[PDB]
């Protein structure tokens, strides 16, 4: 009921004028803001202090403090994140990156 | 561990080849045709590698296969022949 | 050893090579041959356009005062605690004489050229038994 | 250049792991033993003294050295050196954590206050994400400023079973300045013992007692022994970065104007030698405290200058010295301004005007811009003649090339190139040539806010320098011609050209995904004209209708 | 990970290296014991591989006398591969120089004996690659073998191997 | 040393350019030379190539005017101190931006001659034409009244 | 199977409402041939209308909410500050109203 | 540097003809012509008088 | 802030709306799996009217 | 000494070689980049085993280049130069401060300090012969040398040895 | 020119990941290094005239890889180490 | 099930978590004067058997932590009385498909 009321509220605000955006975007925002069992504001700390990649979390202006925390806790960063793949310069598994392109000797044989 | 892959049967992914691998396979085939790799269908004076790849897709002869990553790590495979190109 | 690099076109070799700089491209080309030599040159004028250590010597000068993002009492604490190494170097005497001749030259409304020349003249000798004190007035004047 | 090919296996980065340095790690990986606070101009010319600035680390320019590993400049990544401190000092990035953990553990025993016998901290140990466990432990062990040897009686029925090491008492630490004071009330006189030992805890004793912690205890506190140790969390031996981090800006009038970080390091080494001479000779024990305080202060400043506002620690001149936190903070400090976004290459920027003679996927580009920009092509059997002709043109008329790239990492510039008619342009090479027509290219308007405003276009080269685009695409860009300006972005390879043409092209973005109605349309002049033309009360005669019919380009030829 | 020094010497008191230890796993999941080899056994199997791949190429374009054999497998090697294998020429020269048996059947009988004895693999492979008939002298040569094996058992195996192998 | 390709021919014996000549984009106008000493200024770490380390000032890389009214006079303390001036004609082009006295800023789309400019009965061919749609939404009545 | 059935409830209900037999015979007068044609077109279009896998829905949603927050205006709080509060909670009231039925 | 001036505004085809004589493929007996270094001051006249002639069927 | 918070959300081949860690945000995407574009404001023809009109 | 193990390789293939018959082409490439090669982990790589039924079966196109990457699994024979036991090598070249023994593939050297001081070395020999009773350096020169240690580096293999032991140098 | 965060974002929204990578390397830094396969550090001395890749401290001459990186990221790692902090492991070790 | 008029002294509630596997649950009448689930913003909640939960994990290939969570101290969680490690299927009346399924984990 919390997320339903929240969706009602955000729809009310953004539909007071300049309506409308599609429903699914708003629903996605609500859900990612409520998918922790509790309300989680998108602040410098709210979503930022999740068990999420240190590089994207230091892309959000608490940089040296959160890097010190990461160094002290010595945790590992999975590099499945877009920001990690950008600052490491590899192509992110995104859109066209979301798969691999595999050769096929069998079809190559079959199509002489 | 347990082979991290799947049999060709019970592949529970859509049979409709979608836009991102459309672009990717066109780009790759364009690059091989650019670097003097063997083409696999006849030509009609066209010299653009991308259009060559476009026709080569149009009658369905691409010597590539695709690998889709499920979120765990297990993966399906598909042959670009066995997809369908409608968008 | 000497670690030194001289550019040389490996296909012309006819001289110390007559090459040119294509500064807008950051590249160097053997002008007789036309092959690029090295790429991604580093800037040489915008670094100056962005904005005396030799007179002050090898030791590095520091004009330290007070800031803005701190309390006035802490600036006073900074001024009291910044005076803990004014006796290890002879540079304290160097900028002491520099301040004195700054007072004297700008009291004599002299040019900056004259001020720097006097700085050089003191820095050149600056310590000898031939100096031998002389109340610092003889040597400064 | 060929970038000096190496047979090391090219692989990609998949995992990244943080941590700290053990002092033996930094001493092992270091190359130099920087000891002279003066850096440059030993006599006083060049080939600087064996202190800073490459005895055996990153060179300056045009010298191969890089501790004799010979990658000129632009391949040597720099090589670390290190210095040795007289005394251990803190870390401003870990001050509060040191306070919390010294609260957490008992000194003189070096063990946890609470040990698997209060069921509340038992389940606190049980719960773990990684650090809420640590915070729970910390807030449960605020109290009991005496360490104990035998607390637990109700673990058993009433049996009092000893586990502890020392019966000593703990202070109450007050964080202050850049140091830590204790206060042992201790309540064990003949009276109340109202004597708190206001004693500044030595970095040495904190280091020792941190060395006296269990592995076990590290895991409880959330430390990884192979990567993160509390005794590694105190600075003893300090790495230095090579001059590629802190380059002498080479002031480009006559001088060097050598830079900020190296100034601060010279300060550090000066205070280091001052402290050690003062220690080694007659130490009257009233210069020691402020000398080490200055040393710790300055290394704290070098680390960060954005601290609680008791110092500011500026150099010459009145601009304060920027530390690494100031170098890495938000708004173009190395992350939001060099990694997440950056300068690029292959781009252009002019102003725009309408044109009703370009269809939507086209863009008009000045010949000057298309002469500056370029795009490589690989030489095939198919394009050999056309590229040969286009090389033969030379780099001055428009449909011509600028560079030729051979199979090895070669670039023969066509500008000088007196053998321009003599290159036979063999296969497998790259010819880098001007923008021809209907190449795909990306298009921008600041500020980009939604999915549009990066749209691709084909290019028709036009004279009279300015950009040129169709009027219908105006509102997605959100750009009237009052003096606005766009941006161009030329792709550089086949993959990127293909995916750009197949995704970011305009005509497959008519329907706005954000609001499920098309974002394009026809606008002012043609709208007014189309209502004017579509009225029952108007009519056209034969000559006008013939010209209009010929203006429709795909008109089939039937009237 | 901890920089994992692990200083280790290779000897015959079961003092074996990690990088080539005994129990591996093969790529299909079955356990992969270490394959150590004899000099005469290697001398046989290089010929076996050579004749196998030569007949493989005979099918490809279709669809023990050491003085002849070294130069014949040499010209077979520069039939397809390159002439850079001068060190490989040195290796089969070493094999034909010091391999304890020229013939295949003595090697096969020795391995048929050792498959019943169940000796230590790297130990008996070192013994087979060595070419000697004196057990006590071998123990003086290698004090690792001197500490490991009893001289009586060493000679009782060495003589019933020595009568079989082609003496040099 | 490492002096540019500005083709220094436009200068004179006193290291300046003369007024009234034309300059292209890359022509240098001022000649400078390093008086250091101590650098072993013509005896070491350079050939001869005497003592240059040239600090010449090229013109801005695009524009191309005519040098007009060059003066030299000593500075505050007494040096050699130079000011030049260059003059350029700037004909209107496509992209230039004009405006009324009512906030109707805009630029030139394209240009036409008279014979296809529209024309009235007396033959007063107009200077410029702006679109009517800039009138109602901008609400700029006084522009019309002024006209 | 259950999720797939419950994911097309609205669409199939609408389809049933359109292609009720009394309606199609009375209003639209189809043929057998054109009836097969409209069935195939509905099927083909709907299968062309599914989400393509592998694209950045979150960024799409974020931009689609962000840009019409730029052209939005500024008793009861509204507008930009109310949106900031409800997006940034911040358990402060400024209008803690509650409707009671 | 390669923006054209007004020399190419009316000077007839340098290494080039004055006109192309290309057959249409969409209707019988149709031909398109490309004049260059000319404009309306020609074209309108030719089109109008050719349309005044009766045997033609289309001229634009 | 908003675009930073919702970066890595991806539709995956299992039609789930996941973050980087694979945490599930939507199970089927958007509760329908339907795209962002191919949607019109067409009308249900069963809600309205009378009961009598509906059965008519 | 020589070893047999299943081993994996890592091979790029240029897109020009995407012709209809590439499996045996890759087998050929495996041949001249396995046979006659040296490394540090496995030493000198001698020859291949299991020529049939080899394991490649699949390959990925690299993203930025049309090169196709393949993973090859194969049985083979290599050499493992040990340390601390006796080999009866041959010597081809010699230096003034010791002979350089070529025990098969590598060239192991013995320093003039690593030879026993009571060995009666005469410098006036061609090659300089460090002989006492029978171990005269010849074209054959069967010398029982014990590898000190074959020091491993980047793929250029080097070893050290000595003859300061009874029947070391003596056969 | 500038390729800021918002441009990066709407490129993400398109999904042209290879274009984004191309714009982040070739239009910019594109630096090469070598990393220790055991330390995970960038201390590898690479005498490329001799194919020598000793990693002192680690003391190996074998486990070496070369990678591709933005130069600014190389720099950021350099001063992160100067802050006494970043192992760069070349493959998975979690699964 | 235990219902108190007003406050509980901690001495009378310290030993509530005693005698496993028997569990004791506390409630205020003020918290029970109005049924929470009858509010129309609250969707239907149902409980998952351990078997079908395991089936759910094997189908959607999650591992037990990627599900969206729900607090133990939640009102509907306390209404159902479930404990750690349980999964609640949630049926709510969507607007783009009508009926839509989702799951939470009580962690
Ligand atoms: Mg993460
Ligand atoms: Zn040259
Ligand atoms: Zn170096
Ligand atoms: Zn204690
Ligand atoms: Zn290392």
Swiss-Prot record, chain B:
**Would you kindly state one Gene Ontology biological process term found in this protein's UniProt entry?**
transcription elongation by RNA polymerase I
UniProt feature coiled coil, ranges:
none
Q: Does DNA damage count among this protein's keywords?
A: no
Is the keyword Membrane assigned to this protein?
A: no
The annotated region (Leucine-zipper) lies at: 43-64
What does UniProt give as GO cellular component? Answer: cytoplasm; nucleoplasm; nucleus; RNA polymerase I complex; RNA polymerase II, core complex; RNA polymerase III complex
A GO molecular-function annotation: DNA-directed RNA polymerase activity
Subcellular localization, as worded in the UniProt entry = Cytoplasm; Nucleus
Q: Which domain of life is it from?
A: Eukaryota
- Record keywords: Cytoplasm, DNA-directed RNA polymerase, Nucleus, Phosphoprotein, Ribosome biogenesis, Transcription
Q: What more does the entry say? A: Present with 6090 molecules/cell in log phase SD medium.
Q: Which family does it belong to?
A: Belongs to the archaeal Rpo6/eukaryotic RPB6 RNA polymerase subunit family.
UniProt subunit comment: Component of the RNA polymerase I (Pol I), RNA polymerase II (Pol II) and RNA polymerase III (Pol III) complexes. Component of the RNA polymerase I (Pol I) complex consisting of 14 subunits: RPA135, RPA190, RPC40, RPA14, RPB5, RPO26, RPA43, RPB8, RPA12, RPB10, RPC19, RPC10, RPA49 and RPA34. The complex is composed of a horseshoe-shaped core containing ten subunits (RPA135, RPA190, RPB5, RPO26, RPB8, RPB10, RPC10, RPA12, RPC19 and RPC40) where RPA135 and RPA190 form the DNA-binding cleft.
Q: What is this protein called?
A: DNA-directed RNA polymerases I, II, and III subunit RPABC2
Origin organism is Saccharomyces cerevisiae (strain ATCC 204508 / S288c)
Instruction: Give the shown range, full length included.
Output: 69 to 155 of 155
From Swiss-Prot, chain F:
Q: Where in the cell is it found?
A: Nucleus
Chain positions with Phosphoserine modification: 37
Q: Which family does it belong to?
A: Belongs to the RNA polymerase beta chain family.
Role description: DNA-dependent RNA polymerase catalyzes the transcription of DNA into RNA using the four ribonucleoside triphosphates as substrates. Second largest component of RNA polymerases II which synthesizes mRNA precursors and many functional non-coding RNAs. Proposed to contribute to the polymerase catalytic activity and forms the polymerase active center together with the largest subunit. Pol II is the central component of the basal RNA polymerase II transcription machinery.
Q: How does it assemble?
A: Component of the RNA polymerase II (Pol II) complex consisting of 12 subunits.
Give any extra note attached to this record.
The binding of ribonucleoside triphosphate to the RNA polymerase II transcribing complex probably involves a two-step mechanism. The initial binding seems to occur at the entry (E) site and involves a magnesium ion coordinated by three conserved aspartate residues of the two largest RNA Pol II subunits.
This chain belongs to which protein, by name? DNA-directed RNA polymerase II subunit RPB2
Q: Which residues of the full protein are shown?
A: 883 to 1029 of 1224
UniProtKB/Swiss-Prot annotation, chain H:
The protein's location, in the record's own words, is: Nucleus
Which part of the entire sequence is included in the shown chain?
1 to 60 of 120
Q: What else is known?
A: Present with 4280 molecules/cell in log phase SD medium.
Q: Per the similarity annotation, which family is this?
A: Belongs to the archaeal Rpo11/eukaryotic RPB11/RPC19 RNA polymerase subunit family.
Where does the signal peptide begin and end?
none
A GO molecular function term, named singly, is: DNA-directed RNA polymerase activity
- The domain of life for this entry's organism is Eukaryota
Keywords, alphabetical:
DNA-directed RNA polymerase, Nucleus, Transcription
Has the keyword Transcription been applied to this entry? Answer: yes
Q: What does this protein do?
A: DNA-dependent RNA polymerase catalyzes the transcription of DNA into RNA using the four ribonucleoside triphosphates as substrates. Component of RNA polymerase II which synthesizes mRNA precursors and many functional non-coding RNAs. Pol II is the central component of the basal RNA polymerase II transcription machinery. It is composed of mobile elements that move relative to each other. RPB11 is part of the core element with the central large cleft. Seems to be involved transcript termination.
Q: Does the keyword Ubl conjugation apply?
A: no
UniProt protein name: DNA-directed RNA polymerase II subunit RPB11
Q: How does it assemble?
A: Component of the RNA polymerase II (Pol II) complex consisting of 12 subunits.
Give a GO cellular-component term. RNA polymerase II, core complex
Q: Quick one: where is this thing mainly located?
A: nucleus
A GO BP annotation? termination of RNA polymerase II transcription
From Swiss-Prot, chain I:
Signal sequence segment: none
Compartment(s) of residence: Nucleus
Modifications after synthesis and translation? The tandem 7 residues repeats in the C-terminal domain (CTD) can be highly phosphorylated. The phosphorylation activates Pol II. Phosphorylation occurs mainly at residues 'Ser-2' and 'Ser-5' of the heptapeptide repeat. The phosphorylated form of Pol II appears to carry, on average, one phosphate per repeat. The phosphorylation state is believed to result from the balanced action of site-specific CTD kinases and phosphatases, and a 'CTD code' that specifies the position of Pol II within the transcription cycle has been proposed.
- Known function: DNA-dependent RNA polymerase catalyzes the transcription of DNA into RNA using the four ribonucleoside triphosphates as substrates. Largest and catalytic component of RNA polymerase II which synthesizes mRNA precursors and many functional non-coding RNAs. Forms the polymerase active center together with the second largest subunit. Pol II is the central component of the basal RNA polymerase II transcription machinery. During a transcription cycle, Pol II, general transcription factors and the Mediator complex assemble as the preinitiation complex (PIC) at the promoter.
Q: Which family is this protein grouped under? A: Belongs to the RNA polymerase beta' chain family.
Name listed for the protein in its UniProt record:
DNA-directed RNA polymerase II subunit RPB1
Parent-protein residues present: 840 to 895 of 1733
């Amino acid at each position: 009921a919390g997320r339903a009321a929240l969706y009602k509220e955000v729809y009310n605000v953004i539909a007071s004028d300049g309506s409308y955006v599609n429903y699914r975007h708003m629903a996605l925002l609500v859900d990612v803001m409520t998918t922790q069992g509790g309300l989680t504001s998108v602040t410098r700390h709210g979503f930022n202090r999740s068990n999420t990649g240190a590089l994207m979390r230091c892309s959000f202006e608490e940089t040296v403090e959160i890097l010190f925390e990461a160094g002290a806790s010595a945790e590992l960063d999975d590099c499945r994140g877009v920001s990690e793949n950008v600052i490491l310069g590899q192509m992110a598994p995104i859109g066209t990156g979301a798969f691999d392109v595999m050769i096929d000797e069998e079809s190559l044989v079959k199509y002489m | 561990l347990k082979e991290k892959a799947i049999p060709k049967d019970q592949r529970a992914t859509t049979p409709y080849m979608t836009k991102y691998e459309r672009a990717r396979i066109l780009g790759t085939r364009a690059l091989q045709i650019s670097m003097n790799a063997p083409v696999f269908v006849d030509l009609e004076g066209e010299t653009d590698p991308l259009r060559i790849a476009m026709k080569e897709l149009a009658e369905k002869k691409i010597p590539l296969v695709i690998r889709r990553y499920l979120p765990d790590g297990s993966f399906e495979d598909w042959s670009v022949e066995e997809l369908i190109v409608d968008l | 050893p000497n670690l030194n690099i001289v550019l040389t076109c490996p296909e012309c070799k006819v001289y110390p090579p007559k090459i040119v700089e294509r500064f807008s491209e950051g590249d160097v080309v053997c002008a007789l041959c036309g092959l690029v030599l090295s790429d991604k040159l580093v800037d040489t004028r915008s670094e100056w356009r962005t904005f005396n250590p030799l007179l002050d010597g090898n030791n590095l000068s520091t004009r330290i005062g007070k800031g803005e993002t701190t309390d006035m009492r802490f600036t006073k604490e900074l001024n009291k605690a910044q005076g803990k190494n004014v006796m290890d170097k002879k540079d304290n005497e160097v900028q002491a004489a520099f301040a004195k001749i700054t007072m004297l030259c700008d009291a004599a409304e002299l040019p900056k050229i004259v001020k720097d020349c006097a700085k050089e003249a003191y820095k050149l000798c600056h310590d000898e038994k031939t100096l031998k004190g002389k109340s610092m007035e003889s040597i400064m004047a | 250049v060929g970038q000096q090919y190496s047979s090391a296996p090219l692989r990609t980065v998949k995992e990244v792991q943080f941590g700290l340095f053990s002092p033996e790690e930094v001493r092992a990986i270091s190359v130099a033993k920087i000891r002279f606070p003066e850096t440059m101009d030993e006599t006083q010319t060049r080939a600087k003294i064996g202190g800073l600035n490459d005895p055996r680390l990153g060179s300056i320019d045009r010298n191969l050295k890089c501790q004799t590993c010979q990658e000129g400049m632009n391949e040597c990544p720099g090589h670390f050196g290190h210095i040795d401190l007289a005394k251990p000092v803190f870390h401003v990035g870990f001050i509060a954590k040191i306070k919390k953990v010294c609260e957490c553990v008992c000194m003189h025993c070096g063990k946890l206050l609470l040990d698997e016998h209060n069921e509340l901290m038992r389940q606190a140990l049980a719960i773990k994400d990684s650090k809420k466990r640590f915070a729970a432990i910390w807030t449960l062990c605020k109290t009991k400023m005496v360490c104990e040897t035998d607390v637990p009686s109700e673990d058993d029925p009433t049996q009092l079973v000893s586990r502890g090491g020392c019966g000593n008492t703990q202070p109450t630490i007050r964080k202050d300045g850049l140091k830590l004071v204790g206060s042992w009330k201790k309540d064990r006189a003949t009276g109340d013992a109202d004597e708190p030992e206001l004693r500044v805890l030595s970095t040495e004793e904190i280091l020792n007692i941190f060395k006296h912690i269990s592995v076990k205890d590290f895991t409880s506190l959330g430390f990884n022994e192979v990567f993160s140790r509390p005794e590694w969390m105190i600075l003893t031996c300090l790495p230095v970065p090579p001059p590629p981090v802190r380059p002498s800006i080479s002031f480009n009038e006559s001088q060097r104007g050598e830079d900020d970080l190296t100034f601060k390091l010279a300060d550090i080494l000066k205070a280091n030698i001052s402290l050690e001479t003062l220690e080694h000779n007659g130490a009257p024990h009233h210069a020691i405290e402020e000398a080490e305080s200055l040393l710790q202060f300055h290394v704290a400043t070098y680390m960060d200058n954005d601290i609680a506002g008791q110092p500011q620690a500026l150099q010459k001149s009145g601009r304060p010295v920027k530390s690494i936190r100031a170098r890495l903070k938000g708004k173009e400090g190395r992350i939001r301004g060099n990694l997440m976004g950056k300068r690029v290459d292959f781009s252009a920027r002019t102003v725009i005007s309408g044109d009703p003679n370009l269809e939507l996927d086209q863009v008009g580009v000045p010949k000057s811009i298309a002469k500056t920009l370029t795009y490589p092509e690989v030489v095939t059997p198919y394009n050999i003649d056309r590229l040969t002709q286009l090389v033969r043109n030379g780099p001055n008329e428009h449909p011509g090339a600028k560079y030729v790239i051979r199979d090895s990492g070669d670039r023969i510039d066509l500008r000088y190139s007196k053998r321009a008619g003599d290159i036979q342009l063999q296969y497998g090479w790259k010819v880098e040539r001007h923008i021809m027509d209907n190449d795909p290219v990306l298009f921008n308007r600041q500020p980009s806010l939604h999915k549009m405003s990066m749209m691709a276009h084909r290019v028709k080269v036009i004279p009279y320098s300015t950009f040129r685009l169709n009027l219908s695409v105006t509102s997605p860009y959100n750009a009237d011609f009052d003096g606005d300006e766009m941006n161009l972005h030329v792709p550089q390879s086949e993959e990127t050209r293909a995916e750009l043409s197949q995704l970011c092209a305009v005509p497959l973005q008519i329907v706005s995904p954000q609001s499920n109605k098309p974002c394009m349309g026809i606008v002012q002049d043609t709208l007014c004209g189309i209502r004017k033309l579509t009225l029952r009360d108007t009519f056209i005669e034969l000559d006008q209708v013939l010209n209009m019919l010929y203006w429709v380009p795909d008109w089939d030829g039937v009237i | 990970r901890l920089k994992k020094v692990e200083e280790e010497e290779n000897a015959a008191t079961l003092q074996l290296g990690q990088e080539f230890q005994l129990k591996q796993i093969n790529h299909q999941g079955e356990e992969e014991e270490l394959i150590a080899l004899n000099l005469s056994e290697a001398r046989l199997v290089i010929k076996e591989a050579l004749v196998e791949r030569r007949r493989a190429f005979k099918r490809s374009q279709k669809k023990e006398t050491r003085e002849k054999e070294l130069e014949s497998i040499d010209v077979l090697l520069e039939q397809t591969t390159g002439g850079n294998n001068k060190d490989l020429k040195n290796t089969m020269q070493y094999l034909t120089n010091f391999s304890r048996f020229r013939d295949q059947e003595t090697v096969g009988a020795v391995i048929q004996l050792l498959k019943s004895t169940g000796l230590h693999p790297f130990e008996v492979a070192q013994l087979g690659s060595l070419a000697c008939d004196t057990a006590d002298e071998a123990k003086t040569l290698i004090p690792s073998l001197n500490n490991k094996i009893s001289d009586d058992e060493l000679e009782r195996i060495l003589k019933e191997l020595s009568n079989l192998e082609t003496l040099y | 040393l490492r002096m540019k390709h500005g083709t220094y021919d436009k200068l004179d014996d006193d290291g300046l350019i003369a007024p009234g000549v034309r300059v292209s984009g890359e022509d240098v106008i001022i000649g400078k030379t390093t008086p250091i000493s101590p650098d072993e200024e013509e005896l070491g770490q350079r050939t001869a190539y005497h003592s240059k380390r040239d600090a010449s000032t090229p013109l801005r890389s695009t524009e191309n005017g005519i040098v007009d009214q060059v003066l030299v006079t000593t500075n505050q303390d007494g040096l050699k101190f130079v000011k030049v001036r260059v003059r350029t004609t700037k004909i209107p082009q496509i992209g230039d931006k004009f405006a009324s006295r009512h906030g109707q800023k805009g630029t030139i789309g394209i240009t036409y001659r008279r014979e296809d400019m529209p024309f009235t009965a007396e033959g007063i061919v107009p200077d410029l034409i702006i679109n009517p749609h800039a009138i109602p939404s901008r609400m700029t009545v006084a522009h019309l009244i002024e006209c | 199977q259950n999720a797939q059935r419950d994911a097309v409830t609205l669409f199939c209900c609408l389809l049933r409402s359109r292609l009720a037999t009394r309606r199609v015979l009375q209003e639209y007068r189809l043929t057998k041939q054109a009836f097969d044609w409209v069935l195939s077109n509905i099927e083909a279009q709907f299968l062309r209308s599914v989400v393509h896998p592998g694209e950045m829905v979150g960024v799409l949603a974020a931009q689609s909410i962000g840009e019409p927050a730029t052209q939005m205006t500024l008793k009861v709080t509204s507008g930009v500050p109310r949106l900031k509060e409800i997006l940034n909670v911040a358990k402060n009231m400024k209008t803690p109203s509650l409707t009671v039925y | 540097m390669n923006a054209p001036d007004r020399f190419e505004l009316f000077l007839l085809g340098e290494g080039e003809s004055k006109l192309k004589i290309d057959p249409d493929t969409k209707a019988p007996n149709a031909v398109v012509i490309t004049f260059e270094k000319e404009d309306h001051t020609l074209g309108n006249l030719i089109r109008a008088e050719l349309l005044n002639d009766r045997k033609v069927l289309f001229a634009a | 802030r908003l675009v930073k918070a919702l970066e890595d959300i991806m539709v995956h081949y299992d039609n789930t709306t996941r973050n980087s860690l694979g945490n599930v945000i939507q199970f089927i995407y958007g509760e329908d799996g339907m795209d962002a574009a191919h949607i019109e404001k067409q009308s249900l023809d069963t809600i309205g009217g009378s009961d009598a009109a509906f059965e008519k | 000494m020589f070893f047999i193990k299943d081993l994996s390789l890592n091979i790029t293939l240029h897109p020009s070689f995407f012709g209809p018959r590439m499996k045996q082409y890759l087998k050929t490439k495996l041949l001249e980049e396995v046979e006659g090669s040296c490394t540090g982990k496995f030493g000198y790589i001698l020859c291949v085993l299991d020529y049939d039924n080899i394991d490649i079966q699949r390959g990925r196109i690299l993203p930025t280049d049309g090169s196709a990457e393949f993973n090859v699994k194969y049985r083979a024979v290599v050499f493992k130069p040990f340390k601390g036991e006796v080999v009866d090598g041959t010597v081809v070249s010699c230096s003034q401060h010791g002979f350089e023994v070529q025990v098969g593939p590598m060239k192991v050297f013995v320093t003039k300090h690593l030879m026993p001081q009571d060995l009666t070395f005469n410098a006036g020999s061609n090659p300089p012969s460090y002989q006492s009773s029978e171990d005269v350096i010849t074209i054959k020169s069967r010398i029982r040398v014990k590898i000190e240690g074959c020091i491993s580096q980047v793929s250029s293999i080097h070893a050290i040895g000595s003859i300061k032991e009874d029947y070391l140098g003596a056969i | 020119l500038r390729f800021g965060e918002m441009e990066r974002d709407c490129m993400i929204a398109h999904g042209a990941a290879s274009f984004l990578k191309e714009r982040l390397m070739e239009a910019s830094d594109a630096f090469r290094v070598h990393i220790c396969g055991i330390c995970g550090l960038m201390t590898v001395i690479a005498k490329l005239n001799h194919n020598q890749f000793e990693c002192k401290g680690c003391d190996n001459k074998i486990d070496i890889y070369q990678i591709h990186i933005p130069y600014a990221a190389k720099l950021l790692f350099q001063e992160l180490m100067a802050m006494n902090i970043p192992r760069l492991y070349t493959d998975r070790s979690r699964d | 099930i235990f219902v108190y008029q007003n406050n509980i002294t901690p001495s009378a509630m310290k030993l509530v978590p005693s005698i496993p596997p028997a569990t004791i649950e506390t409630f205020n009448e003020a918290a029970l004067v109005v049924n929470i689930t009858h509010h129309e913003l609250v969707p239907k909640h149902i409980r998952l058997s351990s078997d079908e939960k395991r089936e759910l994990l094997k189908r959607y290939r999650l591992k037990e932590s990627q599900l969206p969570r729900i607090q133990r101290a939640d009102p509907v969680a306390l209404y159902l009385g479930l404990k750690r490690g349980e999964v609640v299927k949630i049926i709510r009346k969507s607007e783009t498909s009508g009926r839509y399924a989702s799951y939470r984990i009580c962690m």
